[PDB]
Structures are given as C-alpha cells and as structure tokens.
C-alpha cells in the first residue's frame, strides 16, 4: 500500500513537462 | 503538501504549473 | 550504480529515487 | 549545471545526491 | 485516491509498444 | 471502457492488442 | 512549456497529460 | 505526422493539443 | 485495483539504476 | 509490435510487460 | 518476495541493493 | 548480449522473449 510513493513518480515527470525550463523544487512535506 | 493536494485529486497542468519555478 | 548520461524525464526520476524524502531541485541551465 | 554534469557527462549516485535539499 | 489516473499512464505506454507502428487511439470513456 | 477492463484486471499483450489500429 | 524533440514513449507520456480526458490519436507516419 | 512534428522539430503544449481527441 | 502490477513496472525501474553494469533478475514469485 | 531500438529504462520496461509472470534477467554486457 | 517486500511498503536503495548481481 | 541485440539492433517481441526466465 505504498500508494504516495508511486504517485510521487509521475508528479516529478508532470512537474518535469509543465515547467520546462523553468525547473522546479521538489518538497514533498511542509 | 502538493502531494496531498495532487496524490489523492487530480491536478491540472495549470495547477501544476504553480509549483514551478 | 549506473554509468551512463542521464537525461531529461530520466534524470528526474532517477533524482526522485535517491533523495527520496529529502526532495530535490530542478534547474536545466545546461 | 546538472544538465551538462550528469546528461552531457557521468554522474555516480554522489554527485547525484548534490542536487538533493 | 487517484488510481485510475497512475494506471492509465501504464496503459499508454503498454499500448505504445505493442501497437508499435500501427498506433491507436486512446479514449477513456465510452 | 478500456479504463475499466485493464486497470481493474490485468490485461495481456493480446487483450491489449484489440485496441490497436 | 518543455521545449525539446519529445520522442517515442516520452511523447505518448505527453499527450497523455495534455489531453488528459479528452483523450488522444498516436498514428506515426514519421 | 506527429514524429516529424514533436519528435523532428520543437512541439509547444499547443502544437500538441492537435493530436487530442 | 490492479496495484501489484503498476508497482512492479516503478520497482524493475529502480533496480535498473541501483543494478546498473551488475544487472539483475527479476523473479516476483518464489 | 515495435520496430525501433530500446535502449536502457525503456529496454527493461518493454522486458517487464512481454515475460510478465515468468520474470525476466537483465544482464548489460552490451 | 521482492513484490511483497517493496510493494506494500517502500525499500530504499540500499534495500533495492540486495536484490542485484 | 541483449544490449547489442535490442538497443544496436532491432527487437521483435520474439528476440525479446528469449530473455524471459
Ligand atoms: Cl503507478
Ligand atoms: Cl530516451
Ligand atoms: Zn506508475
Ligand atoms: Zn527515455
């Protein structure tokens, strides 16, 4: 049931082809 | 956290693109 | 561990695996 | 340069973890 | 709790390589 | 939909070839 | 937006996320 | 041809909103 | 609810780059 | 099926999907 | 098995190490 | 060598499931 951490996967590679250039910090927790 | 907000919803490339930089 | 150039969507997921909790940064400046 | 480090060149689990927070 | 949406990345990909040259149409519902 | 056949069950190479062109 | 030559899997991967409920046709001709 | 088009030359989120349904 | 079998492509992954020249085998059930 | 060279991630995930059950051994002698 | 190792809860690299040749 | 095989050649899903167990 490690759910979170597979999402986690395909966030980086949305955030990766959204951002662009312009790159991103990833955070998981506040 | 975004993973909070787009791990249990779905997030759209436009609520993606605040997390950018 | 791999030997090899590591780039776009891969070196992000390859990022994502090894901080893992910490989190990472991602800025392509070249 | 990440980019130029570890696509234009080799990069070891190390100096992968550089660009860690 | 947005598993339908990891899976339907697998399954593109899936369709990708096994359709190979011929491609394919992705419709989520009918 | 193909949605509700292979991410509830797991479809096959064979299954998966249906929805080719 | 990403700007680079998006090939085979990485392209699927992207329409994927663009069209997202619309959907989408991978037909290369090349 | 979307492999010419994305894959041969540069594709802007909008010159692959083309290929959607 | 086809959880095992996506998490299965993101684990070969991952031994792919912790593996790397060394490789592996991939065996899911004893 | 495809016709194009895999190379790498996508080498592994391709091997994933066709064995399957059986399982499959990486080995990157070249 | 490593499916029932890492797919229920998560290994770290060192853990994915074991598994290798 | 499946690297010389499927990535410096090409792989029909046949020479690729020769390396199945
Ligand atoms: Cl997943
Ligand atoms: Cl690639
Ligand atoms: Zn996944
Ligand atoms: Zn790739």
Known sequence: FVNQHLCXSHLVEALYLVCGERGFFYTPKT | ?21
């Open chain 2, 1 to 21: 956290g975004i993973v909070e907000q787009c791990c249990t919803s779905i997030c759209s490339l436009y609520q993606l693109e605040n997390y950018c930089n």
